[model samples]
Target: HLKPFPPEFLWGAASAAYQVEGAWNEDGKGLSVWDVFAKQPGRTFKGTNGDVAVDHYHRYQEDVALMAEMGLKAYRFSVSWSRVFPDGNGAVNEKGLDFYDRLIEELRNHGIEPIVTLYHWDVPQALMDAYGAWESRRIIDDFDRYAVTLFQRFGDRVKYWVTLNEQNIFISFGYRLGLHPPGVKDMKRMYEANHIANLANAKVIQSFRHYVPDGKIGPSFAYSPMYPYDSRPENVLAFENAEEFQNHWWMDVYAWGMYPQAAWNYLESQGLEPTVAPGDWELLQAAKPDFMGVNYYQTTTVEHNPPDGVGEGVMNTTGKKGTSTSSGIPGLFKTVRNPHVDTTNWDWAIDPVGLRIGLRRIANRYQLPILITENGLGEFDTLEPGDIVNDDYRIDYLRRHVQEIQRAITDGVDVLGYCAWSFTDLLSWLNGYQKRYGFVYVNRDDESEKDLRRIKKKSFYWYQRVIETNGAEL
Candidate 1:
């Protein structure tokens, strides 16, 4: 009774340059904010850095071969800005451009489509030093230039382009949470930098119309749909507040070119609103994406929080269940455990239905076709003897999520395609190597880089069938 996926639906997987590609300081590559930040004593988990993450920079050919064998239709990967524009501006790194050129050609030869994300939270350290990176307006011009460069060079081959990978995430983690690069814990500066990022995003998309006229482009958003804790009216209102503040705050700007009113009012009241420039609205309104790129992981349930209640708590990067505590805005909404759904070791909700709900909401609100850029299970996959990883849990997680995608498609959402969270095991940013999410498991961990071997997991073979059958078998 389920509707069939469109014949042209792309079965894909994604990876970011910082998370996968490791030639950190090779071939004239400049330092990214992550390159420096991760090297710091306590920046990353267990002091684990991506200095040689999976060695994807060197083994991409083999990786692409593996993807080809799995019958992948699309491979969504990010470009390292510092690799191409070493100092963040000026002369182009010829070798840097050449690396991607070869990778694109290899994927093309194997009939795998390449979906390019311009930035994946890796700002060149040089840019950070030059003018405080995203915090200052200078980033608008620098980022715009960097994006257009990729478009001019690789746009001919890459049709699906992502402007900025999770603008909200980088802005929040960079400024508010102080977990990522340019680490600062200032609310006012966070808003200012976020506004600049929005401007830069719009500017690049507007320029995309000129350089890559035939291509499809959008920003990849980390969307976690909000649910009320219970049937109480206060809880429902809290859910609405969470939606406006958490989801719509960034997505509305991407799709509708405006901030959600309630969230903006709250920010203004707290004097945390960014100072908008003269033509910011015009640029945002003018540049509309072809599709909404959603990187959905899970859903969060919320309840009303009193003015004197909880604030942000310590994140659970330890991969220990129940270690993560609840976090919320004082007078807005606080996250609560949803008893109905199960959770992962990191306390992330395993609600597959949330994907369908998120898809429906985006379609209903934006009226734009949706491309699911990322969704997968991040759990510990034990590498059994003889390179065997029986990750049936991951298979179940993905199969259930994919089923919801079909349901959403039948529900009249014009879904473009789905790109699994990763093509292979790579870095997990804050969580380190312990939180593994991939079809192919790389045998390496936080303490030691054990041969950096790439072994196909049980999910890899399961996913191959899903792709071959075009989601029907799943």
Candidate 2:
């Protein structure tokens, strides 16, 4: 049996500025890393870019109307640093700040709480070109300056703040995988850049308290809980490594301001130690978050492998629908097929129990309230006549996940909210526009960009009913 949600539980939807807001360079907006990266040939899927993503900048009024109609309690959206400060520092662009000012007012007018994410992988290209972005320790001050600006601007109206979105994902992709902006495929660079990012994250959180005393703030970690393939001791150790290096490496620093001993020793042995100055640890400790914002997607299972095991694998960049392959670190842990769990069209494992486990782990470890910042099944949706989208698969996926949340709540996990990965179909960062994850379907193709009409999927109404009942009817 599942427990009931709190009366004031926040049922929300989320979107990043780069993924949804299309006005990439409008109104004095500067170019973001994504803005520049996507323009490079063969960088993105089918050469598709967010240059005009769903036109959210111009269509936010309609987007807010959809949220209000869904009875959403909160809406989590990111503020583009480049949009606010074209140069990543110095004088503030009033026009860039004004865009978010009006966005917040619109949400408030519709009785919706605004959850703001400070950085969502859309770093100003100017910063990266000038100072190597997160790779430079100077980013600590620059990030704090940008975060302080937002807190002062929207702190009064916005009580829920996310300091950074998916620091783990951004760091991994930026350095290790070479899939994201400033892509570098070096493990040493990955570890070093990741450390600077961690310190920058801590500094931003530390600075946020001074500005938004009335609000809560934390980093949104892309946590895919790990499971051992079998009872073998080697498999169990592999699982431990996955948890330590992959999950705890970033989370332990955020929650406890310290690195896991095993992971740190390994990184040091590999000559990948992060450059930490005198007061870095102290700053991290001082900047504990009010809650843990988790972006739960899927769980990974690990098994034993030899020292010269499988190396880095390819990711499904071209939205060829059903062509994703499993990937893992060689000699550390190899990803195995989870026969018990069903798979999405894109090969992502669908496991609702993982969400419960994720919530429980955070509850036991940090004891801080948990906010599910992102969770949804990304898949292909077919549009029928009259613009009707029967996305029963998406409904099933979200329903099962929400049920797990209720179970976690019943087990006494302090959960504040559950915001679906997205509210409307927009340009997926790497997977192009085909891998859709939204209630409102945007009529566009993976090839040529068509008229991006907004058609409400069946899940849209289902979620609306779920919100109305406070997770009772669903």
Candidate 3:
């Protein structure tokens, strides 16, 4: 038997500024690393960029109205740092701030609680050009100033705040994989830049206590729980290393304010460890979050890898099935397919139980209230003859996952909310627009920006009842 979700459990949906908001250069907005990166010849799939991403900046009113109709209790959206501070720190972009101010007002009008994420991987191009963005310690003060400005202006209304979204992702992808902005492929630079990000995260949370005294704050971590392949002793040990290096290396610093000793030592052995300044430890220890924001997509299964085994492999950004190849650190662990679960077209595992396992682990370790900031299936949907999108597959995926959330709660995990990965079909940073994740489908694709018409999928009506019943009917 499963326990009932708490009556106050927040039912919500989420979006990032770059993924949804399209006014790339409007309203005196400064250039962001993404704006420039996406414009490069081969940065995104088919050279698709977010220059006109569903035009969310201009169509937010319609979008909010749709949320209200869906009976959404909360809306988790990110603020573009470049939008608020064009030059990253010096001048204020009043019009940029004014856009969010109006959007917040609209959300409040419809009785939807606003969960604002301060930074969502969009560093101002100015900062990158000036001091390499997160690579420089100067980002700490500039990021804090940006966070403080938001708190000063909107903290009174927005109670739930996310300091940063997927710090591990942007850091690793940007610095090591060269998949994101300010692209580089140096292992040493990745660790150093990521360390600076750790400090910046702590500094913003410390400031949060001073500015938004009544608000809640935390970073949104992209956590994929690790599973050992079979039960072999070597595989189990490799799984341990995978967890420490891939998951704990980032989450431990966020929740416990310390690095995993084994992982740090390993990095030191390779001369790839991050340099921790004198006061960094104290600052990290002093600031703690009210909840753990988890953006769980799937669980990774791993097995032992030889010292000369695979490194990074090409990702499946094309949405072609069986195209993604898993990679790993030479001697630590390498990802393998879990024979038990199904997969999406993009080669991502579709395992609802993974969410429960992840939630339980976070609860047992951190003992903090968990906010599922993102979990959803991205699939290709068809608009049939009558302007209908029958996304029953997505409905099935979400139902199973939400049921797992109930099971996790029954297992004693303190859960605050579950926000689906997205509210509407928007630009996937690398996968282009065809890979859709939304209750509402926008009428635009990679070939051309069609009318940008909004069409409600079958899941839209399905979710309305879930929210109305407070998860009792689903």
Candidate 4:
């Protein structure tokens, strides 16, 4: 229906090292904050951790072989910071870098472009102990060094680089909600830590210009475009508030190098604003990204919330139906159900058209090319005896999303590529192993490895054609 996807469009799938690469302690790898936090009792669903996640560390060759068989044009994977810089700074681990060297060579051998994500929610435990990790401003220099090291090492081969994977998710869940690593529940500290993260992000992007002049780099935002519940004026105002506070807070800094005035004023009024020293604005503006990386799952419907209404609530990490509680900023907006759309097993809203809306918003505001770093469906998938997963629901979900992405491309968005959330069913942060989002389902669960095998799903063949046809079939 729309113009065919650009010939250079990257048809890809992605995974994080912490999620896929098992052998957590093998080859001089150091402990990460997630490794320590996920092991804590009751921290993750079913008390699961990724100590041996799908065994991808030793099994990546087979996985990339599958990607080549599927005609995958790209493969997005992350590097663990602790693996490279054992203490998050200073020493560089040669074995850790060698692992990625082999992986990158394998991908390129098959002509699959590699998209490298420098950070995927794994901070070194050493930094967490030495400097309070993200809480202290000292993290900026360490992070900048780590990022620079990545650019210097992998820049020659990796043209597509994502600086941070969902800063919003990490800052919100880790700081404000106490769900992620280094968990703390203080709004002021959250904003303060978030600002430092911003500075670090800008510095890395600036350094990118110096280190990897030919490559593309940006932060991957977990962006869910906000929609008003209805046409009512109060709901409309609430939508604006949510967009400014939630979306613009990070994106504006990335794109325009300034915070939205209205959101800044509101946060300052409540003493929730972060400290922005002199020249911070200049640094932010100067280190602009080559593109915007987005990890879109769904859109949220926003409605007005009273100053005392709706506080912190738990996410549906157990994949239970109708169990996800509502979350909102008091005195601003609350996330409400969209009656017009269906929901996933975890109560995440399923709205494909919203993906189009999000692309349009980013296009209009930032006027930058967008690379969909992560997008997929998570559900309880059943693996049949023949190692087949006839996941028609997953095929349908991805088709709808692809259709909207095509529409967004037709609407003049400088789109780059689309990468599904994962290549194999690995760790799901809080949701654990059961919430699957992979075309090639890894044979494992929270209980045991079950041989740690890899099985192709029905969606795998479907996507193979989608890539072979350059998205024409989808």
Candidate 5:
């Protein structure tokens, strides 16, 4: 490798509360929007709720010990907003605070740096009931209050903070497709709620200075770097339009505190623009984050399309390969297959080079240090002849990506760390447990919870070497 990994480079893994913590209603925890939505008969994949998701709440000590054994340098996890403020506001739950307090101590005791995320899709159902969650501007203060509580409680030892896990995803999925919680398929409502979510994100980041002055905080974006499907100028322009409409809509507000003019104008033409109040821009500009948190998944290929072309397509939740459909907007662009890239069983593009390209784009545009929040392969793994889960496919996927990250570093991209998608196998949101993405494989599936056993895959030892050698082995 031309550029060796940084001495203090963080090779870590990540997890979320609802996806991992099985004690859904225990220890003074209140109902999150997900808790209610996932319980709805037809809401989640296989109707799987996180009522008993791997029991991480009780088995976190074991999780931290595993991290120590693997020589993990950092652990990025999300705090359940409802766990701290059961009703989403007012009362502070000591029990919830106590749980995370102990968890932080355990990680630090094992020499693993704790990277905390303030929100991860699971909003308090009470906030939804009180005023329709992010739909109301009133949520700006409530979300900010919930974030401040986390900063105050864990600010001492936790130096890294992620304000929102995937703001673009939760808002769009919830409001536009009716896929997630508070499901409502209204474009107008989607934009309105999204604007408020942006406001909440900015406000909480601004308040982080007072609470955790020394800590670094940012929001994690699900970045699918865009590309033109062909060499045609129309196709190239279509990709540019897609970038403005999709990527810049959120990242621009976070970085520059202003909306891209073309994107704002395009939304206005379609009457999809959100209502921007007098002081919203000022609030966003005032709040700034130290680094941009990147959740690299895949690259999207875009092509020219007429006003009456295909719209968004069906998501491939089933693990059956080659089942994902094409999706896109009508006038802006349509999704096209990338002939050069392979795909996961879930139909997600597998492009490690795209990760480096996206990182360079972020550096050139925002010039901010990048922390890779999540990136990994999600597939159906097989247990071999022994007690081992020999997931060599995952090993190859992660290895190539790590190699690409080394290239990005050599290219002068300021990288902070790389936290793989997960430490242990957890719920896969819409895909349930079948689409596994972890170094440690948990014995569980959508049909049956099974033993919930944690098995170290082949990649687990491979990653141990990566961290031990600091990318030299890779």
Candidate 6:
């Protein structure tokens, strides 16, 4: 037996500025770090960039029309900081602001609510060049100014605001892993930049409340719940370590305005603790989010890693399937395969029940409503003759996840909304264009740019029906 979702539950889709919007430098847009990073030799796979990512910057009208036709209640998209303020601060670019103005109006005209994300890892390269973006405390004021400008312009129309998208992922990849832009591989610098990012996040959130009092805002965290590999005590300890270091380190700060005690102790011992100012804790406590925005894709099973275990592992940047390897910190927990869970083509573990666990954990700890901002399976798809895309696999993935959402609701969590990872297939940040996750499949490859035509997958009709019935027919 299944239960129906509440009448006001938001059915939505999400996209980021760098992932979907092409026209990198069109109409007074400035250069973002991605623009510079992609140009570096051997950085992105196939040297792919978001230069013409589905042409969404130009085809937003068509995209909005599709959302209207699908009866989506909300659409979450990021505003490119570089696009709005090319130099990242001094003077505003009217043309860059006008693009979002038009996009917001289009969604509103079609009765779709716009969930705006202020920063989604598209910091202007000028800012980085000037003062090493997110590495200095001065960024707090500039970030606040930029965010407040957006609120002044589009606050009235937008109801939901996401301050930052996946702080953990960005901090880890950008600083420690050296995978993303401004790629630095220093642990000490990573902690410093991360502390600045946390402070900036809190500052923007605090400012947003002043400008948009009626709106709800939060950061989208990439939350992957941890589980013990077996019943052994060592394995259980490993799970606890993973939970504390990976999940609670960020969640506790965002929700309770404090770092987890265990994680703080470990970081202190390693001399990698984030530098905190005198009033930073008070600022974080005051700027608590209205809800927790979770971007869940999978769960991680933990096993004990020795003091000299494997270090950082290689990620699947190329389009080749089954290329991702297990990564582990030397003295922390290692990611082990869950025997009961299935995996994606990219070796990402798929566990629907993990969503339930995540929801329950957030509810128990934060006591705030949870908004599932992004969740979907990324894989390769085939576009057959006559432009038919039978993405039944995607439909199945989303269907099970949606059912888990209902179960969590029945379990008494105040579930707010569920925005699928994307509405259409767009460029993946590092995996290039081949790892598709969308209801509408764009005919393109990692090497050659195809027609870039939008073909409706079978999941599109399935999701439309689900929305029509308000999750009853799914």
Q: Write the per-residue lDDT of candidate 1 for residues 1-474, one digit (tens) a residue.
A: 799999999899999998999999998999999999988888778887778888999999999999999999999999999999999987889899999999999999999999999989998999899899988888888888888888999988999999888888998989999888888899999999988899998999999999999999998899999999998999999999999999999999999899988899999999999998799999999989999999999999999999999899867767778988889998989999899999987899999999999999999999999999999998888988988999989999999999999999999999999999889999988768878899999988888778888899999999999999999898
Whole-model Cα lDDT of every candidate shown, in order: 0.92, 0.88, 0.92, 0.90, 0.89, 0.89
Q: Candidate 2 residues 413-468, lDDT tens each?
A: 99999999789987888768888899999878878677777888999999999999
Give me the runs in candidate 1 sitting further than 4 Å from their true place. Answer: none
Predicted structure 2: clash tally: 0
Q: Candidate 5's error at 10, in angstroms?
A: 1.1
Q: After superposition, how far is residue 234 of candidate 2 from its true place, in Å?
A: 1.2
Clashing residue pairs in candidate 6 (N, C-alpha, C atoms within 3 angstroms)? none
Q: List the candidate 4 regions with Cα displacement exceeding 4 Å.
A: none
Ten-residue stretch with the least lDDT total in model 4: 311-320
| Tens digits of per-residue lDDT for model 4, 1-474 | 588899999899999988889778888899999999999998887877778878888988999999999998999999998888888876899899899999999999999999999888899999999988987878888988888887888899999999889999999889988889878898898999889888889999999999999999999999999999999998999999999989999999999988899999988998999987888889988988999999999999989899998877667766678987778988889988899999987788899999999999999999999999999998778988887799899899999999999999999998899999778888878767877899988877877658878889999999999998998998
Per-model TM-score, in order, reads 0.99, 0.97, 0.99, 0.98, 0.98, 0.97
- The candidates, ranked best first by lDDT, are 3, 1, 4, 5, 6, 2
Residue 183's lDDT within candidate 6 is 92
Better of 1 and 5 by lDDT: 1
* Candidate 3, 80-127: lDDT as tens digits: 999999999889999999999999999999999999999888999999
Instruction: Estimate, for each residue in 1-474, the C-alpha lDDT of model 6 and write its tens digit.
Output: 656799989999999988889999899999999989887888877878888888999989988988999899999999999988899877899899999999999999999989998889989999999999989887889889889989999999998999989989888999998988789898888888888888888998899879999999998899999999999988899899999889988888898888889878888998989788899889888888999999999999989889999778776555455777678777778887788987875678779999999999999988989999999978788988987888888899999999999999998899899999889998887768777888888878988897888888888889999999999988
What does candidate 1 score on TM?
0.99
| Over 4 Å off, model 2 | 317-326
Give the CA lDDT, 0 to 100, for residue 458 in model 6.
86
Across 283-380, the per-residue lDDT of candidate 5 in tens digits comes to 99988789999998899999998899889797777667788777888888988889999888777899999999999999999998999999988878
